[PDB]
Write a protein that binds this ligand. Structure first.
Ligand SMILES: Nc1nc2c(ncn2[C@@H]2O[C@H](COP(=O)(O)OP(=O)(O)OP(=O)(O)O)[C@@H](O)[C@H]2O)c(=O)[nH]1
Ligand SMILES: Nc1nc2c(ncn2[C@@H]2O[C@H](COP(=O)(O)OP(=O)(O)OP(=O)(O)O)[C@@H](O)[C@H]2O)c(=O)[nH]1
Ligand SMILES: Nc1nc2c(ncn2[C@@H]2O[C@H](COP(=O)(O)OP(=O)(O)OP(=O)(O)O)[C@@H](O)[C@H]2O)c(=O)[nH]1
Ligand SMILES: COc1cc(C(=O)c2cncc(-c3ccc(C)c(O)c3)n2)cc(OC)c1OC
Ligand SMILES: COc1cc(C(=O)c2cncc(-c3ccc(C)c(O)c3)n2)cc(OC)c1OC
Ligand SMILES: Nc1nc2c(ncn2[C@@H]2O[C@H](COP(=O)(O)OP(=O)(O)O)[C@@H](O)[C@H]2O)c(=O)[nH]1
Ligand SMILES: [Mg+2]
Lengths: 431, 125, 427, 425, 427
């Protein structure tokens, strides 16, 4: 279990994926040309998880960049670290999907996906011990959501014994005005329930609320939002990328975090919350990190964890701090807040500490929760879906590409089934 | 008394002293073969006893063999039952794991047929 | 003659083997290249023509990380490379993958290596198997190994040292499942299993050694002392020795009832500024010094094996043990007229320099079979029941080919095992 | 009726056997190199009963040393008199008996037993007139107990007309080595009932009680118990070893001591009792019929003597010895069966045991010995009724019936002792 | 010439033989080397071509220790090797072992040696057979031998000197068995048997000789004097009992009642000297303290009575001694027999072993009488036999040698018949 193959699809997928690669390259001392320039060997111990060694002392991200829209990979190559990616791993169509899931999933996306599998197989067969795949995408658009889920299915067909992980950006009317985003999200969640092992729910609604309410940004941009996404992605992959006592990998994570196969949608949290590019004038304490981490203002999904119960929790602290103090804060948070942890999964909170903090922070903490409160996210989507589907608003966008109402009905049904089983386990007793 | 001379010899003499005459006038085998038969008969009883003793010790020897043999049969039966159990659960697990993977790839393939129906329905419009 | 082969499975088993074989080399004067300036250590070390002394041991793990540290660490020349066996993917904390999916790819190799070790023994006593209950390899591969050992070697003695999981020490959430599954599968195949509770070892390192946050190396070094006490009788010329057959005979009154309680004394901080035979003997019946958290005053003893090492005289053991026989808080079952076996090896305990344990002139390891150990089983079974009632995490086991029937069949065996401990304690 | 062949088996067998050779070599003036250095020809008149006379004017014990474990005989070899034994008379296996009678009797013993018989068979052919065998062993362990009784059986098959004599050490929870001593001992008592002619019952229970209560030894050790065993073994062999007008041999002893074949278990006694390191004829006579002096944990006033053989050592009035023995018989008349006239025989030997100037040794065939077997039977029954530890015996091939028959026989022995205790004229 | 052949069987018979042949040699002037400076002594000694005088004797003992005395003794040159018959293994105090197991082994060898002696005789009278009642050899082999002597020497007299057991003297617990078994088997085959009660002889030595604990030598020295008195008119030219036939003529009116009582006086201590009169020693013949079997002649009737005087004894004095006791004492003979005595004087003086404990005396006497009182000795033996045989104590040792249990009861019935016969004639 070492190599991960990263895939980024659509505008959102490629924007957050690029940011992810800038952020971890800086953590590992890799500059935009692929040369290592860091000071500590621990930057390189597990560097193969995300990077191939190209001869010439260089490191190339194991990353495949996909979009039906050609322009978004022109903007990747022009961003900082555009030059770090393998040029042949850019796979671009010449027409976007018009925020239309059926275009991404059935028609134009399906005409490009074999082009994508070419690159995916080459990166995979090169691996000594392939862990699996992580995909960044949004659920509200046409390419990330439709072609991204299609891609998942195709890859699962060829690599069914490998872990399939996603970072999936949920739509919010606060951030985008595209009215069919509830449709695309609901069609995609149907696909993700059946075909991924772990999905990090990154909620644009939560990201906007954090930027507006906590960071005091009157008009937050995708830059402001993606700063929070990239802090999360760095935190939740920290254990994969540095050597710890845990022999952390994607399958051990899934085994211990997912008690029921469909219930694999995690609520990420992070502390401290910062604005992008901003000097931090005081570090947070271990009790501060521990408390602020289980606080609804720090969740990357617009859900109050106190409205449900945790099935499982994985937490990672970064920086120089007492592991003793970390253990006593974590245990105390579980005892005082005993009623937000299901009692029929004993010892369901796991803590790791990595001595290396992220850039700009002396100390930080990242939170991976499998909470039954995540049903609030799916209910919000499902309500928005129904208000449109009652009227059959915009359906001809989809039937024009070959779909049928029945596929909408089923996806709506499957997400309401998801809500119910979250609720079933929320109300379940140990007697 | 009445003394009566009996004899006189070189190194002694003898006689008889009568104090009273009697009140009453007057006075009121195995062969060699037989002996050998009884000596031989006792020998054959000795030998029969020894033979029966040795017969009982022989019976104990064979019980010893049967005990040592039974322990070896138990060990062999332990091995045989362990072997058949393990092969049974290994093949059952293989069948299960292959059946799960085939169902998983069967569902994704129905999806693949359905995508062809979507693309056909489009050109039909 | 009288050889024992040791088998160390998964992370926990391999790291504990590190502490054991380090201690043995120090105990016998063996350098880390196998060279060496009482020949009983030959039960545990073969010898090459160059006078090199090679542990009669296999290290197995389904992932190479831990055993790679052996391959590049201090004792990298102590073992032959072929004795250090690694796959490429671990069992991901999943019994089903250790036992079937992943373990089946390497099991034939391990048995081939063991069979080559057995071929070097003229009087094999048995196998000692070190493993965790909670790991996917420690549970699932050990179960497979033990089954294949029964096929290959019949009723040849198999004894285990097993790490019982504790929330304090890093613990995966499905560890209760793996513990019950390996115990069900292994029960018929093991003759005697010495359980080690990570919480108990943890608490001792804190109370007796004043180590705030003990590490595995802290825990393993204490575990290695206890292990060394058990095997000392087989590795030295002693006054009173106790071979593997004597352990099984005197500690195991019924086949299923084969889980003795280990206690050890003295455990003294190396930074503290000599305890009598009586003192360290009485310490073996104090609940603070046990290797498994349970309450022997709340149970009944069926057998006590006391293993002394160092500066110990039999008149002192006899007087110490006679005191014990008068304590009313130490209750023996009705059907055990005589419950004490004693061994005395004269070489004092050894300690790794730079460790935390102090060098002492005399120490003792007690192995007791008490009905109180059932309290440890009940704790596991309750955790298993909490999750299993919702079938939490079961899909990861079924996905690898196991059937739910294997779970309830294993849990019913533990229920029957718990009722057995009740039964043997009646009058 | 000259030579005895001596066999010691298992750990206990070899410890008390070595102590015995140590003691009698001192009495016959034999040093550990095998050279004679005594001061009297009384010591060499019957020395061939126990020693072969080597080429270089040397004496070698006629001893065969057996164990399934190398450790104990290793210890013997380095002991005080270790060098005196014929080095090829050490027959030792490698993998022990696991404190398990079934292993010593069936599995591991069988694999070694013919190596032992070869050495027994060589010592027997170097005898002008073989008297028989003495075996030292415990009954509570695996080797001396299971392999010892297997040896007895095989030796009976090969020499069915030689006397078989054992010194058999009884287990006691007061001095235990293994939890399965009740099983091991019960399975052996069965064998001895069937296959020995004379068995001296040496009861660790009695030895511990003597050391604790009489010698004031707070914590007895094997050294202390074995001091009592060697004094007893010296005592009961004195008549085999020194010329007495009785012309003592093992068959004559059995003829006059064993009225009924199964009742051949003797209560040994000894006066005075001594601790390691540290009296009158009337006392010797009494102290010797005193429960505090029996090496079996049995009160002889709880039954009746069938026959008694007594030996007094040291210079003393044989008139006064005969006086007092009669006085004791008359005062204690109800503890002797009336239907065996004159059932106490007294011998005297002039040579005192080392360190003592007067000693007495008692060999009783008492119906009170039933108390020894009842104690074993009760401990057996407490274990066997729960079938505790049984699987280590069935796993060797044994049937449960072997267990029940062996204790059935031991309870029959008890009943038979009881039947003669209550018989009258 | 009237030769007699002496046969000595078992330890008691051999050691008493030693005492007798030593005393005969002193009475006849035969030195220990066999040389010698009245020719009647030839009835007991032959002569070789070298001039050596050789006892007409065979010694049989299945244990070489006792006969090895003879071979290396003081009188060792008197005997030729073929007179000394040993084996390796004695009868272990077991009549059945002596009679059947070894009897069948050695009987032909023994009869062959006796026959070599008998072929040297021109007028063999018969045999004088010395043996214990109590030993396995003395009882068991003797009775087989007597059966064979009746076959091979039909018309020859057989006299026995039988040592009757005593608890004081070294005595096995089964001696009453062996005593009744050999009495039964031998009864029909002996003409005259002089019993010697070890208890009587022990009592005479303590009282008359002042010996606290008499040895076998003390007893055998005294028994030698009695045997000498009985055989003195065979070995010198005497006038009473001048051939063996005359013993049954003068003492045995009824063939089964062939057990005379011997009384002897005086026994005087060598340490301790008035010379006793003919009256005093004659008085001593009617004192039970001087009998050789313990019994009370007041409880019986005489059938026969011989006075055998030795040394300075004049007929005048004997007749006046006899006249004194007849007026003061009641001496009851049976009705059918005359009341009186046969009197012999042998002029040869009584001789003692120099340095022994018997003093040299001028005159002595032995009274041989056949009284019914001696059946009290049989009743003592029969009672001990009955006490043990009721429980079958020790019988398995006899049955193990091939004897049938029914021989015990057939022998005991014969003793019952013998007691009844003594009753009938003592009416
Ligand atoms: N957090 C975050 N969300 C984004 C970003 N870019 C687009 N989105 C969200 O993504 C959704 C629209 O999906 P897109 O990625 O733009 O669509 P696409 O995958 O490129 O598909 P097409 O443009 O129709 O070809 C809306 O909910 C947007 O709010 C971004 O950079 N960061
Ligand atoms: N005492 C002790 N316990 C350990 C050690 N290492 C792991 N454990 C315990 O073992 C259990 C985890 O199982 P591991 O042995 O690490 O897992 P594994 O056998 O290598 O199996 P996989 O990694 O799942 O393939 C937990 O209960 C740990 O606390 C150790 O070095 N010493
Ligand atoms: N008077 C006397 N009696 C003896 C003598 N030796 C043995 N006895 C008695 O003889 C009886 C024992 O029989 P033994 O003649 O010694 O034995 P054995 O006939 O040689 O037969 P075994 O049993 O085969 O030794 C006991 O009653 C002894 O007291 C002796 O020298 N003189
Ligand atoms: C604990 O933090 C992490 C752990 C892992 C593991 O690989 C791993 C390994 N072993 C066990 C567990 C575990 C997880 C959760 C629970 C409730 C539990 O009981 C055990 N996780 C990976 C991570 O990032 C990918 C990570 O970062 C947040
Ligand atoms: C008398 O003491 C002993 C005798 C013997 C005999 O060999 C022997 C020989 N002849 C007779 C008897 C005998 C024994 C018992 C009774 C009741 C009896 O009436 C006679 N014993 C051997 C001894 O040590 C082995 C011994 O030592 C105490
Ligand atoms: N008296 C005495 N008893 C012993 C000695 N050694 C062991 N025992 C007893 O022997 C029994 C154990 O048997 P042991 O001889 O040690 O086992 P073995 O070697 O298998 O025959 C227990 O009852 C112990 O008390 C000893 O030196 N003296
Ligand atoms: Mg592992």
């Amino acid at each position: 279990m070492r190599e991960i193959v990263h895939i980024q699809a659509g505008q959102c997928g490629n924007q957050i994926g690029a940011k992810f690669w800038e952020v971890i390259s800086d953590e590992h001392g890799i500059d935009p040309t692929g040369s290592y320039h860091g000071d500590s060997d621990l930057q390189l111990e597990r560097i193969n998880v995300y990077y191939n060694e190209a001869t010439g002392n260089k490191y190339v991200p194991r990353a495949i960049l996909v979009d039906l829209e050609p322009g978004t990979m022109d903007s990747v190559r022009s961003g900082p670290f555009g030059q770090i990616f393998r040029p042949d791993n850019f796979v671009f169509g010449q027409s976007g999907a018009g925020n239309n899931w059926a275009k991404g999933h059935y028609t134009e996306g399906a005409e490009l996906v074999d082009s994508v599998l070419d690159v995916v197989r080459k990166e995979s067969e090169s691996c000594d011990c392939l862990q699996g795949f992580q995909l960044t995408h949004s659920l509200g658009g046409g390419t990330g959501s439709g072609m991204g889920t299609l891609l998942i299915s195709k890859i699962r067909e060829e690599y069914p014994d490998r872990i399939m992980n996603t970072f999936s950006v949920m739509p919010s009317p606060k951030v985008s005005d595209t009215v069919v985003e509830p449709y695309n999200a609901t069609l995609s969640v149907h696909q993700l329930v059946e075909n991924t092992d772990e999905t990090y729910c990154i909620d644009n609604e939560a990201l906007y609320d954090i930027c507006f309410r906590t960071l005091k940004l009157t008009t937050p941009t995708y830059g402001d939002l993606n700063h929070l996404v990239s802090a999360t992605m760095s935190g939740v992959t920290t254990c994969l990328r540095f050597p710890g006592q845990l022999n952390a990998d994607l399958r051990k994570l899934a085994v211990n975090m997912v008690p029921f196969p469909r219930l694999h949608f995690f609520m990420p949290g992070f502390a401290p919350l910062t604005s992008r590019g901003s000097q931090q004038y005081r570090a947070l304490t271990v009790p501060e990190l521990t408390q602020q981490m289980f606080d609804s203002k720090n969740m990357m999904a617009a859900c109050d964890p106190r409205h449900g119960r945790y099935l499982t929790v994985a937490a990672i602290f970064r920086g120089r701090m007492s592991m003793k103090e970390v253990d006593e804060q974590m245990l105390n948070v579980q005892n005082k807040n005993s009623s937000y942890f299901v009692e029929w999964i004993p010892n369901n909170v796991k803590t790791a500490v990595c001595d290396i903090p992220p850039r700009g922070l002396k100390m930080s903490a990242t939170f991976i929760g499998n909470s039954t409160a995540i049903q609030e996210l799916f209910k919000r989507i499902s309500e928005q879906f129904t208000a449109m589907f009652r009227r059959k608003a915009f359906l001809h966008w989809y039937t024009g590409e070959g779909m049928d109402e029945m596929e909408f009905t089923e996806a709506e049904s499957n997400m309401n089934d998801l809500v119910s089983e979250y609720q079933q386990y929320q109300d379940a007793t140990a007697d | 008394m009445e003394v009566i001379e009996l004899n006189k010899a070189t190194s002694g003499q003898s006689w008889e002293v009568i104090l009273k005459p009697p009140s009453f006038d007057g006075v009121p085998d195995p062969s060699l073969e037989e002996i050998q038969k009884k000596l031989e008969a006792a020998e054959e009883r000795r030998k029969y006893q020894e033979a029966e003793l040795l017969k009982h010790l022989a019976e104990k020897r064979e019980h010893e063999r049967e005990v040592i043999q039974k322990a070896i049969e138990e060990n062999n039966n332990f091995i045989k039952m362990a072997k058949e159990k393990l092969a049974q659960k290994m093949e059952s697990n293989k069948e299960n794991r292959e059946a799960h993977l085939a169902a998983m790839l069967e569902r994704l393939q129905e999806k693949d047929k359905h995508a062809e129906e979507v693309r056909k329905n489009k050109e039909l419009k | 003659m009288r050889e024992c082969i040791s088998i160390h499975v998964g992370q926990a088993g391999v790291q504990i083997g590190n502490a054991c074989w380090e201690l043995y080399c120090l105990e016998h004067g063996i350098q880390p290249d196998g060279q060496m300036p009482d020949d009983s250590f030959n039960t545990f070390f073969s010898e090459t023509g160059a006078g090199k002394h090679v542990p009669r041991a296999v290290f197995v793990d389904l992932e190479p990380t831990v055993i790679d540290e052996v391959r590049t660490g201090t004792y990298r020349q102590l073992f032959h490379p072929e004795q250090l066996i690694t796959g490429k993917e671990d069992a991901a904390n999943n019994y089903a993958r250790g036992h079937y999916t992943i373990g089946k790819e390497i099991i034939d190799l391990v048995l081939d290596r063991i069979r080559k070790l057995a071929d070097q023994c003229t009087g094999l006593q048995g196998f000692l198997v070190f493993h965790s209950f909670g790991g996917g390899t420690g549970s699932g591969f050990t179960s497979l190994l033990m089954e294949r050992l029964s096929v290959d070697y019949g009723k040849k003695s198999k004894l285990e040292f097993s790490i019982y999981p504790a929330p304090q020490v890093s613990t995966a959430v499905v560890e209760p499942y793996n513990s019950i599954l390996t115990t069900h599968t292994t029960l018929e195949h093991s003759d005697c299993a010495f359980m080690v509770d990570n919480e108990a070892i943890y608490d001792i390192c804190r109370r007796n050694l004043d180590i705030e946050r003990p590490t595995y190396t802290n825990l393993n070094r204490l575990i290695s002392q206890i292990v060394s006490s058990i095997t000392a009788s087989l590795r030295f010329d002693g006054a009173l020795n106790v071979d593997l057959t004597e352990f099984q005979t005197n500690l195991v009154p019924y086949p299923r009832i084969h889980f003795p309680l280990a206690t050890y004394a003295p455990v003294i901080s190396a930074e503290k500024a000599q305890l009598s035979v009586a003192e360290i003997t009485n310490a073996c019946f104090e609940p603070a010094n046990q290797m498994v958290k349970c309450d022997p005053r709340h149970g009944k003893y069926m057998a006590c094996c006391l293993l002394y090492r160092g500066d110990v005289v039999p008149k002192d053991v006899n007087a110490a043990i006679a005191t014990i026989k008068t304590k009313r808080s130490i209750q023996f079952v009705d059907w055990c007229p005589t419950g004490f076996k004693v061994g005395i090896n004269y070489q004092p305990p050894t300690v790794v320099p730079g460790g935390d344990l102090a060098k002492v002139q005399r120490a003792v390891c007690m192995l007791s079979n008490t009905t109180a150990i059932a309290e440890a089983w009940a704790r596991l079974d309750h955790k298993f029941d909490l999750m299993y009632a919702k079938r939490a995490f079961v899909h990861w086991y079924v996905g690898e080919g196991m059937e739910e029937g294997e779970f309830s069949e294993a849990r019913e065996d533990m229920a029957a095992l718990e009722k057995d401990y009740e039964e043997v304690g009646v009058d």
